[PDB]
Each structure stands twice: as C-alpha cells, then as structure tokens.
C-alpha cells in the first residue's frame, strides 16, 4: 500500500544517492578497485530506482 | 585510521544493510521485477563492503 510502497521507493532513492557519495569518498581516498565496484553499484542502484519509480511513483 | 577511511567503510556497510532491507520489503510488496534487480544490487553492495572491509577496517 501507499506508505510502504512510498518508503520502498525512498530507500531505493537514498541508496542511489549513497553510491554516488561513497564513490566520491573512495575516489578521494585513491581506492581505485573499490571505486570501480561502486561505480558499477551505482549503475545497479539506478536501474532499481527507475524500476521502483515505475511501479510506485 | 584516517577517520575518512572509516566513513567510507561505514557507508559501504550501510548500503549493504539497506539494499537487503529493501529487498525483503520488495518481496513483501510482491514486486517481483523490482525484487530481482534489488537482489543483484544487494549482491554487489555485499561485494563492495567485503573489499572495503579488507582495505579500511
């Protein structure tokens, strides 16, 4: 229903944000293997936010 | 250890936590197509944390 569907969409949104913010942090630290994995993680996080926005938006 | 390295690790752990909570909540909402992407996302969140734990913790 609306409140738990909305909060599922809001969790997918802040996870997409957090993968950008952690990629920036990994990049300042010079941690290049981890920064690649986090860039890719941000690709998956995007696809899930789009999927959740399509269903619950 | 740098403080910043620990900020990176805690956030990689958070994303690990939340893609999993969101995965279970998407299964509770019977949202199959979204639960499929979130399981793959959580897997990579888990992978990023293992990598960052080895390097920063």
From Swiss-Prot, chains A, B:
Keywords, in A-Z order = Plasmid, Transcription, Transcription regulation
Question: Is Transcription set as a keyword in this record?
Answer: yes
Q: Which InterPro entries does the record cross-reference, listed alphabetically? A: Regulatory_Rop, Rop-like_sf
Task: Give an example GO molecular function.
Answer: identical protein binding
Q: Which cysteines are joined by disulfide bonds?
A: none
Q: Name one Pfam family in it.
A: Rop
Q: What does this protein do?
A: Regulates plasmid DNA replication by modulating the initiation of transcription of the primer RNA precursor. Processing of the precursor of the primer, RNAII, is inhibited by hydrogen bonding of RNAII to its complementary sequence in RNAI. ROP increases the affinity of RNAI for RNAII and thus decreases the rate of replication initiation events.
How it assembles, according to the record, is: Antiparallel homodimer.
Name under which the protein is recorded: Regulatory protein rop
* Species name: Escherichia coli
Q: Which gene encodes it?
A: rop
